Amino acid sequence: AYECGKQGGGALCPNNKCCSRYGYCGFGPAYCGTGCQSGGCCPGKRCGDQANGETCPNNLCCSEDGYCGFGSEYCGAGCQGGPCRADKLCGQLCPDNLCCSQWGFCGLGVEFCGDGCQSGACCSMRCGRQADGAKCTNNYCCGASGYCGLGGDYCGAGCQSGPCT
Amino acid sequence: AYECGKQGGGALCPNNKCCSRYGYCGFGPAYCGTGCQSGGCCPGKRCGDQANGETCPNNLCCSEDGYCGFGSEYCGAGCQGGPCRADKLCGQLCPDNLCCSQWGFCGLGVEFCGDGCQSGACCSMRCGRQADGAKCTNNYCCGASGYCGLGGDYCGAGCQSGPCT
Numbered sequence: 001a002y003e004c005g006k007q008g009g010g011a012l013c014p015n016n017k018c019c020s021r022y023g024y025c026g027f028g029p030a031y032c033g034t035g036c037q038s039g040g041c042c043p044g045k046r047c048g049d050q051a052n053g054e055t056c057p058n059n060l061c062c063s064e065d066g067y068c069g070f071g072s073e074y075c076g077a078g079c080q081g082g083p084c085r086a087d088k089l090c091g092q093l094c095p096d097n098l099c100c101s102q103w104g105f106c107g108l109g110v111e112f113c114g115d116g117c118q119s120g121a122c123c124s125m126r127c128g129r130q131a132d133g134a135k136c137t138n139n140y141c142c143g144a145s146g147y148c149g150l151g152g153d154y155c156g157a158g159c160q161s162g163p164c165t
Numbered sequence: 166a167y168e169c170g171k172q173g174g175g176a177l178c179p180n181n182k183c184c185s186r187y188g189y190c191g192f193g194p195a196y197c198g199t200g201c202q203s204g205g206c207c208p209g210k211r212c213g214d215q216a217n218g219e220t221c222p223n224n225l226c227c228s229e230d231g232y233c234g235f236g237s238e239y240c241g242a243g244c245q246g247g248p249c250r251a252d253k254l255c256g257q258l259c260p261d262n263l264c265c266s267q268w269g270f271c272g273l274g275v276e277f278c279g280d281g282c283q284s285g286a287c288c289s290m291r292c293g294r295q296a297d298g299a300k301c302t303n304n305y306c307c308g309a310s311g312y313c314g315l316g317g318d319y320c321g322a323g324c325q326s327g328p329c330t
């Protein structure tokens with residue numbers, strides 16, 4: 001069975017393993033070279049203003065030159081996306097489902113996703129009847145019990161609002 | 166068909182989607198809460214000196230307190246792992262298959278993994294017959310054509326050294 005990439009239903013490889021053009025995880029030219037779909041591709045995948053605004057897979061940083069990677073060259077000055085070293089403001093959605101904290105910064109973890117979380121992958125944003133009709137952000141689904149999320153548990157049976165199925 | 170985690174061959178979800186305790190991708194308490202395996206867990210997965218050296222999945226930063234996330238609270242002062250904002254020295258292999266550049270910093274992309282790459286996910290590191298019996302770093306496999314890597318193409322048939330067959 002395929003492991004990753006379009007052959008593997010969009011899954012990523014663990015530990016920055018490259019997803020080959022054939023949808024398997026590994027390192028070396030056969031995986032990280034021509035056709036590499038994700039992970040530590042070499043060269044790095046094209047991103048940002050050099051890929052129609054597509055972000056790097058695996059939370060890699062998008063360099064000023066529009067290549068995916070890590071290190072000061074990628075995350076530092078000129079960084080376009082991913083975990084840049086610069087604080088990322090929001091209010092305006094965060095990229096890649098990052099939580100917009102009550103303070104208006106993007107991140108993950110309770111400080112961002114917990115109390116006061118405005119959008120993105122909030123821990124427990126209420127919605128639906130339980131929240132008097134409140135809507136979810138990010139086009140998430142409101143589950144049966146009145147929490148915002150994605151996946152079958154929220155978009156499937158009982159789904160109240162959002163892109164239910 | 167499981168998607169992720171221990172049920173899904175250790176696969177990650179894309180775009181920070183949480184892998185539920187049951188091996189499916191999504192957001193909300195069912196995925197990100199109790200039992201969350203990877204992605205934007207809430208709270209963040211335990212990591213670092215507080216979790217037996219475990220690194221964060223999906224290249225999340227490990228906070229001073231040993232939780233996985235993004236933002237200055239996680240990647241900034243006291244960051245233990247992942248794409249911390251501080252340059253990351255190596256010589257001490259880089260965590261999670263990051264390339265140790267010729268200059269002794271961890272990263273991904275050609276500047277790190279290309280010419281002069283010492284270890285990690287180097288673009289092209291020769292080995293075996295084709296390189297005078299030179300061994301691969303990181304316990305990678307030496308392919309039949311004398312390139313260092315992982316996955317079937319390197320660890321399968323023709324494998325010269327490392328965790329072959």
Ligand SMILES: CC(=O)N[C@@H]1[C@@H](O)[C@H](O)[C@@H](CO)O[C@H]1O
Nearest residue numbers: 087101103105111112236237238
């Ligand atoms: C939870 C949160 O949003 N914390 C942010 C922090 O990430 C950011 O670095 C700082 C910028 O001054 O503002 C804090 O409030």
Ligand SMILES: CC(=O)N[C@@H]1[C@@H](O)[C@H](O)[C@@H](CO)O[C@H]1O
Nearest residue numbers: 071072073252266268270276277
């Ligand atoms: C490819 C490489 O290692 N580049 C490093 C850079 O990541 C680091 O931030 C800088 C610190 O002075 O030194 C450079 O040589």
Ligand SMILES: CC(=O)N[C@@H]1[C@@H](O)[C@H](O)[C@@H](CO)O[C@H]1O
Nearest residue numbers: 020022024026030031316317318
């Ligand atoms: C370069 C490539 O994708 N080749 C794959 C390899 O990655 C995978 O590990 C193997 C199954 O074990 O099947 C090969 O065809």
